[model samples]
Target chain A: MKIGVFDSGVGGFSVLKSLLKARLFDEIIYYGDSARVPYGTKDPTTIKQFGLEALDFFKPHEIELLIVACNTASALALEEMQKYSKIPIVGVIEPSILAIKRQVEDKNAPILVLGTKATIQSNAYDNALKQQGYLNISHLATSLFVPLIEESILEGELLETCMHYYFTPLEILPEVIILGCTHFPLIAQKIEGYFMGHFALPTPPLLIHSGDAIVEYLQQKYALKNNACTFPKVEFHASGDVIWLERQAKEWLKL
Target chain B: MKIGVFDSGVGGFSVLKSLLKARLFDEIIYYGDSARVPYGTKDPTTIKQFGLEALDFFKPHEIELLIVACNTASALALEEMQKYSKIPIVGVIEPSILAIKRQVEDKNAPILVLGTKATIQSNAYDNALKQQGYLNISHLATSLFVPLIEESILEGELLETCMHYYFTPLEILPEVIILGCTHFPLIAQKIEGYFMGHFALPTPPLLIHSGDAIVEYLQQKYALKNNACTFPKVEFHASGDVIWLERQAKEWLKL
Candidate 1:
C-alpha cells in the first residue's frame, strides 16, 4: 500500500512519476539525498554510507517496499542496503537491464549503456548482461551529462555541443541503449534524436516494468496486495534545502 | 593558533589560500559542506542549520577563531551564528564592504555587488554600505554564474555571453565592484575582463583585513598572543566526496 523511492537528488522524481502513472500504490514517500547528491563518482564505501543513511531515513515512514532509484547506489550498495532493511529493496539497474535485454532478443546484441562514472566503472550493467550471456554490450560513462540535465540546460546549442562531445568518441554503434541513470529520462528526447539510427527506448516503458516487478516481488515475498488508488498521496523530503528539491521535483515531474 | 574556515563548498578554498598567504596562524581547518553546496539559494533557516552543524563539527577541534568563508552564509547567518559562538567569528561581507569603502572614498560611489540569489536577497553588504552612508550602491543577483564557474566554463565566448546577459542591463557603471561570493574570486579574472573599464577588487585584500582584524580583536580582548607558527597547516574536510572535491580543488586552485 505504501512504497518509498530514494535518489541521490531529484532524479528519483522520474521513477516516482512512473510509479504514479502505474497507480499501484496508495501512498508514496520520496526522499532525495540532496545534501550529498551525485553519488555516481564516489567510492564504494561512501556510496554504501549514503545508501545506508537514505535507507535509515526512509525506514521511519513504515513503507511496505523500498525503491533505490539511484543508479550509483543501485550499482554499488543495493544488496548491502537490502540485507538490513526490513522492507523489500528494488533497484533501477536490474530493471533497466532486464527491459533492455527483453527488447534486444539477440544474445550478442551490441547494447550501449550510459551512466555516471562510478556506475559505469562498477560495470553493474555489463556484468548483468554478461551473466545473462550478452557478450557484445558496450558501456560509456557520461558523468557530465547528469549535472547538465540537473541544471536544465537541455536546449540550445550548448546541449547540442555537449551531446556531440559525448557521442563522438564511441567506436561502435549498438542496437539498444540502456539509460542506466534515472536523470537520463529527462533528456530522452535529445538522446533519441542524437541516436536516431540506434534503438533508444523511452524511460516510461522501462520504468513501468521495474515498478511492476517490485510490486510482484513484494506481493509474493511479503503477501502484499497491489492497492490501486485514484489519487495517491505523495510526500517529499530532502536532507537539505527542501524548497530547491521541491522546485526541481516540480520541474522534473511536471507536478 | 588554530582557525576554522567554513564554506558551503570549494569556494572557500580561495579564502583559505588567502589565509595561508597571510601566514598568521599555525593551523587552519577548512570544512566544506560539499554535500549541501550552493547555499546561496537556500533559506535562511537552512543556512543557519548548516552553519550550526559546521560549528558543532569544528568544536571538537578547539579552534581559537572561526572564519565563515561562505558569502551566502556570511550575508544571512553570520550575525545569528556569532551570537551562539564563543570563538571570534569573522565573515566576508563586512570585510568586503570595508575594502571597497576604503578604496572608493566617494560617499555616493556606485558600487556593484555580484553574488548568488540568497546573498543578494540578504543585502548584508548593501545594509553595511548604507550604514556607512554609501547610498548610491546597486546590487545584482546572479545565481547562474556560480554553477557556470564551478563547471569550469569561466572563459571563452560562452562566459562572455552569460556575463553580458547579467551585467548589460545595469543603468549606471559602478565605481567599485565587490566579488561578494568567495567562488566569484576564482573567476574574478574573467569577470574583470568582462568589465575591463569597471573598477574591481579581488577577495583577498578584504578577507585578509578581516582575518587580521579578528586576530587583533581577539588578542586585544582576550590577551591572546601570536605565539603560534607563522605558516599554518591547512586541512580540508568535505561531507560529500573527498576525491571529487580534491579534483575540483586541484582544478580551481591549479594545485
Candidate 2:
C-alpha cells in the first residue's frame, strides 16, 4: 500500500521514520509545507488553507492511507481532510492521547502536558489524560519551544535561556513530561539535558511524544501491508527546499 | 578502565554512546562544555583553552584513559593534551579517516568529503583519503552544516537552502560520500535523503560517518554481561546543564 504523510513542517519526520522502520508499505510519500508551516498559532481558516495546500500533493498520488503526521494539523485539518478523502485520513491526536494516557499508570502522578497556547487552551490533551485517570494536570502553554525547535536552537546559553523561559523552575517537577507539541520531540535531547541540569542524577522525568502513533497505525497487526518488504520506496515532497526536505526527512526519520 | 570523554558541548555523547556500546570501559565520565560548545569554527588557541577546561574535570577524577571525543579538540588540541595528560589520551581524527577510507573499497570510485570549514580547510581528511590511493577527491568546505546539525534543523527551507548552496548543481556525483566532520554524520539520514532525491534509487551515494569509529576505538569485541552482579556507574559533568548533559549521555550512550 502507498501511504501519505503530511506535516506542518519537518517535525513529523520522527513519525514518518517509524512508519518506514516497520517496512509495511509499497511506498510512502511525505509532504512538508514549511513555508506555511507550524499551525500552532494560526486561526482555523488559515490552518485549513495551509494544510489543504500540502495535502494537494497526495491527492493525485493514489494513496491508500494518509497520515496527518502532525498534531497541530491533526487538530485543525484532519476532519476537513477526512471529509473529502478517497482514502483513509487520520490525525495523530488519538496516538497523542494514547501516549498521554499511558504516561502514568497510577492516578496521583500528575501529568504535565506542554503544547501551544491554542492546544493547551483547548483542554484537548488535558481531557485525554484526564479520562485515563490522570487527575493532576499542569497544562503549560510552551509556545516558544515550537519556534525554538524550528530554528534548531537545541543548546548553548541562548537555548537554555529560552528553555528556562518555557520550562522554568517547577515547584513540583513533572513525573511524566509530554512533548505535547510536534516540534518538542525534535530537540528532546536538549530538553532532557535541560531537565538533568535541574533534576537528580540517573533519574529525569520520562520523555514522551506521539511519533509512535504512526508506527502503530501501519503495523503488521493492523494489516496495513499485504506483502511487506525490507526496503520500501520513500517519496518526499515539499513546498520549500527539496534538498532540505530530503535531508531533514532522512535525519528526522533516521532513514 | 576509567574512560573520560570530553566534547565542547553535547556532540561527544555520540562518541560516548559508541564507547559504552563497546562495553570495554569499567566507567565513563562525560563532560560537555555547554557554555562554549562547537569547537569546529573556533581557533586552535580557543579550542585548546576550552579543551583544557573540560580536561580539568577528568584530570582530578583519576581517569585511566582520556578520549578527546570532540573532533575539533582532537584536530587542534590532541597533541597538547597528549603531552599534558596524566594518562593516555586519544583523539578521533585517525578513526574518522579510517571510516572514510573503508566505505569505498575499489579505490577507483571518486570520494567526496564534507565537514566544518575548518576541518575541510585543514586538508585533514583530504590528505588522509588522498594517501589511500583515492586521489580523485573533491573536498568541499561546508561550515554551516555544523551549526545546522547542532541546531537540529534536519529539515526546512533554511536547511535545504544551506544544503543546496553547498551541494547543488553537482558536476558529478561520487560512489561514496564521506561525512568528514563529527557533526556532519549527525545529519546523514538527511544527506542520504537529499541524495536519493538527487541521484538514482537502490544506489544512492553510500553515506559514511565516524560514530561507528568510536565503536571501533574501545575494543574489537564485547561479550554481553549475563546476570550482571554489579551496575555501571556513569559520571556526567558539564559547564552549563548537568541535566542536559546526563540526559544526552544516556541518550547518546543509549544507557
Candidate 3:
C-alpha cells in the first residue's frame, strides 16, 4: 500500500522519518509545499488553498492513507482538506491534544503550548484544552524559533539567546509545555537546558506533536497491516525545489 | 505562459519575486526543495541526482521555460538538467560571470567568490571566468553565510564578526566580490558594510549575480511570451512544512 505524507516544508520529515522507521507502507510519497511554507502564519483561506493543492498533488499516486504532517495546516486547514479530498486524512492536531491530555495528571496545572503565530492565533490548542476541561492553559507563539531551526543553528549561545527572548515573554508558568511544532523537537535538548539552567522552570518534560498518536490510532482502528513482502520505497516530492528539500531532509533526519 | 522556478529552499523566492515584479509570465510555480535544503554542502553526485528529481517534478507542468534559480544546482547541475530535460534551463552562473566580466576592467585584479561549499568546490565561477580567458580569480566557500541569512541575522556586529572570520584567512584582497548564492544577494548590504567598516577591505563596486541576467536571457532565447493581461500568478511549493516557509517568506520579502 502507498502512503502519502504532505507538509508545507521539511518539518514533515520528522513524521515521515518515524513512519519509515516503522516500515509499514510498501511505498511512501512525501509532498512538501516549500515555495510558500510556514502555513502557521497564513490565514485559513490561504492555508486551505495550499492544503488542497497538496492533496491534489498526491491524488494521482493512489495513496491508501494520507498524513497531514504540518502543524499549521493540521491546526487551521486539515478538516477543509479532508472535506474536499476523498482520502483517509490523518492530521497532527487531534493526536497531539490526545497525547497532551494523557500526560496531564493534575487538572489545575496549566498546560503551556508553544507554536507559530498562526497556530496560536487559531487557538487550536487552547480550544482543545478547554474541550478536555483543562481551563488553565497558556499558549505562546515563538515565530523566530522556526527560522533558527531552518538555518541549522540549534546549538550554542544563539539558541540560548533565542530561548531567552521567547521564554521571557510568557505570562504564566505552565507545568507542561507541548512542543506544538515538529521542528521544535530538534532543539529539545537546548530548550531543556535553558529551562533547567537559566529560567529555573521545572522540567515537566516535552511532549511531541501528534503524528505518532495519529498513526497508532489509525493502526488500532483499521487493523492497518504493515506491508511485509515489499521493501518500503520513500519518494519525496516538492512543489518547490527538490534540491533544497533533499538537503534539509538529509540534515533534519541525519540520513 | 507558465514559468517553473526551482531552488534548494526559500532562497529562490528572491528570484521568483524578481520574476513576478517583471510581470513576464502568466503563471509562476516556485518549487523549493525545503526538505533537503543547503545543497551547497552535498557531493556532486547527490546534487546531480537532486537536480534530476527537480526536473522530473517540472516535466508534467510543460512550462514555457525552466529556471534553475538555485546557486548550488546552477553551479553544479544546471547543464546536466538542461541536457536531460530538453527544456530551456536558465542558471545563475554564466549570467553572473558575464555581469562581472562586463563591469571589471582589470583582468589581473583578484575576484573573490563566496557561496556554499558545494558551489565553491565546483569552481563554477573559476570555470566561467576561465572560459572568458580571465585567469586571476580568488574563490572562498564561506558556508556560514547562508545559515546567517536564513537566521535573518544579517546586520550589526554579528555579521561583521562572521564576515571577518570567513575572510581573515584569504591571502589577497579581491578587486571584485561575486555573490554566488541567490541568498547572498539578500545580505549584500551587510557584506558591504562588513568590508568597509570592519575588514577595511576595498569594497568592490560591482556585486553581481545571475538572477537578472538569467531572466533576460530566457526571455530572449526562448521568446517566452509575456502575461500581457493580468499580474502573473505566483505560487510557492515546499518539500517541508509550509508554515516555516510562509514565515520566512514574509520576513525576508517583507510580505
Candidate 4:
C-alpha cells in the first residue's frame, strides 16, 4: 500500500527517513509546504488551509494513508484534515503519545514535551498526557529548534546554547522526553549528549521521536509487516522549491 | 517633519532606536510586518508587494520621508517603492555604502558585507561598494541571524558558534564590516567581541551599522539637526500585530 507524508517543510524528511527504514509501504508520497513554511508560527486558519491543500495534492496519488509529520499541523489541523481527507490521516502527536505509553510504565515519570509555539499552544500532547493519568508533564515551546535544524546547525556551541536556554527552566530533568516535532529527531543524539554532559543521569532519557513513533504506530495499528528489507519508491513534492526539497531529502535521508 | 520607518518585522526596532537617538523627526511612524516576518528568504515579487503595501500603510500619515529599514525590502523593493511614493524614499543599503566610504579610506581595504539571502542575492551593497572603488569585498548570507535576533538570542555560545560559521570562511580578516541588515545592529557588540576574541586585530574592525548610517545619511543629506535632546513621538503599527510591535519597540528602543 502507498502512504502520503505531509509537513510544513523539510523537517518531515525525518519522518520519511523512518518510513523508508521500516519499508512498510511500496510507495511514499511526500509533500512539503516550503512556501508557507514554519506553520508553527502562523494562525490556525492558515495552517488548516495548508493541510487541506496538502490533502488535495495527495488525492491524485490515491495513497492508502496520510501522515501529518509536522507537529504544529498535526496539533492544529489534524481533525480538520481528517474531515476532508478520503483516507485515514494520522498525525505525529498521537503516535508520540502512544509510543511513550509503550516505553515507560511510570505515569508519574517526569516528561518533557518540546515543540513549536503553535503545537504547545494547541495543548494536544499536554492534554492527552494528562488524560492518560500522567501527573508530571511539562511543555516547552522550543520554536528555535525548527529554524536551527532547517539551517542544519545540528550539534555545536549554538545548538548547546539554545538547549541551555530551553532546558534551563526545567528544575527536574525529565525522565522521558517527547520529541514532538518531526525536525527534532535529527538532533536526538545531540539532545541526549547535552543532557548527559549537563546533569548526572541515572539512565539516559528515553526520547520519543515522532518519526520513530509514527513508523511503529503504523506497523502495529494496521498489522503491516515486511518480510524483506527493500528500499521503497518515493516521490518528493513541495508547494515551493521542489528542487530544494529534493536536495535536502538526499542529504538528510542519505538517498 | 514626520517620517516613516518600515521593516518586515521587529528587527526594524534597531533602526527606530537610532532615529529616536538622533531626534531627527517630530514624529516617527513605525510599521512591522510581523504577520509575514523574515522577508529575507522569500521571493523578490512577494517582498516587493510587501514593500508597496507598507508604503500604502504610511501614505495616510502624511510623512515627509520614508525609510526602508529592512535589508531584504531595501535590496529588492526600493526602486519599485520609490517609483510609487511621493516622498523621497531611502533604503539602508546606500546609506551603509556611503557610511563605509566615510569610515574606511583605503580602496584596498578588505571589507565584509553580511545580510540575508535575498539581500545578498540582490547584490545592492556589493554593486554599490564596487562602484565606489572598494577593491576587496566579500558577502556572506547570514540568514540565521534574523530569527536569532527575533528570539532575542543576542549573545552567548549559540551566537558565537553562528559567528564562527559565518566568519570562518574569510581567509583575510575584514578591516571594515557592514551590518547590512537592520536586525544585525542588535548583536553588534557580540559580533565585535567575537572578532576580537578570535582574530588578532591590530585595530578593531570598523562595524558600519544601518541604523547609525541612516541617521548620519539623513542628517547630512537633508541638513536636519536638533539642538535639544528629546524623545520623538513614535507610533508603532503592524499589518498583523500592532500591540506586539509596540511592545517590542518599547523594549528594544528603551522607551
Best by lDDT: 4
What ranges in model 2 sit over 4 Å off? A169-171, A224-227, B1-255
Tens digits of per-residue lDDT for model 3, A1-255: 788998888988877766765567788899887655666654576677777788789889999888888888888888888898777888877887777667776767767888888889999888888888887788888876776687677786556666776788777766677888868878877777776776565563455545566666666665666544357887888755678798788877674
- Give candidate 1 regions above 4 Å deviation: A41-43, A106-111, A133-151, A168-175, A194-227, A241-248, B106-110, B135-175, B196-231, B241-249, B252-255
Instruction: Give a tens-digit lDDT track for model 3, residues B1-255.
Output: 777999988888777666765567878878887766767756687788789999988888788678888989998898789889776788888877767667776778678888888898988888889888776788888776776677676774555656776787888766678888878877777767666755565653356655766766666666765554355567777766666676677654553
Candidate 3, residue A206: the lDDT equals 57
Local lDDT at A48 for model 4: 76
**1 or 3, greater by DockQ:** 1
Of the true interface contacts, the fraction found in model 1 is 0.17
Candidate 3 residue spans exceeding 4 A from truth: A1-3, A8-10, A17-47, A57-64, A105-112, A116-121, A133-154, A157-174, A201-205, A215-255, B1-99, B102-110, B115-123, B133-175, B181-186, B196-255
Scoring only the A-chain of each prediction against the true A-chain gives TM-scores of: 0.88, 0.87, 0.92, 0.96
Mind giving the per-residue lDDT tens digits that candidate 2 earns over A1-255?
Answer: 778888867887877766766677778888876544545754455566656765678889888888887777776677788877777787777676665555557778866777776566667777677777777778787665665565565666556655665676455677777776778777778877877777654767777766765566446235755347767888877654566667776566653
What is the per-residue lDDT of model 4 for residues B1-255, given as tens digits with 9 covering 90 to 100?
A: 788999987888888888788888888888887766778877676678788888889989999999999888999999999999789999988998888887888999999898998899988888999999998999889988887887787887777777887888777788788898878888888888878878865557889989988889999998888533465677888765466677777778884
lDDT of 2 by residue, B138-247 (tens): 87767667655654566755566567667875676877787666666567777777777776656578766565675574454234342222355677787654665565
- Name the candidate, 3 or 4, with the larger TM-score value: 4
Candidate 4 chain B, poorest ten consecutive residues by summed lDDT: B225-234
Model 1 lDDT tens row, A45-93: 7788888888889767999888898888899989889998877898877
Of 2 and 4, the candidate ahead on lDDT is 4
* DockQ for the candidates, in order: 0.23, 0.01, 0.07, 0.30
CA lDDT of B183 in candidate 2? 65
TM-score of each: 0.81, 0.48, 0.63, 0.84
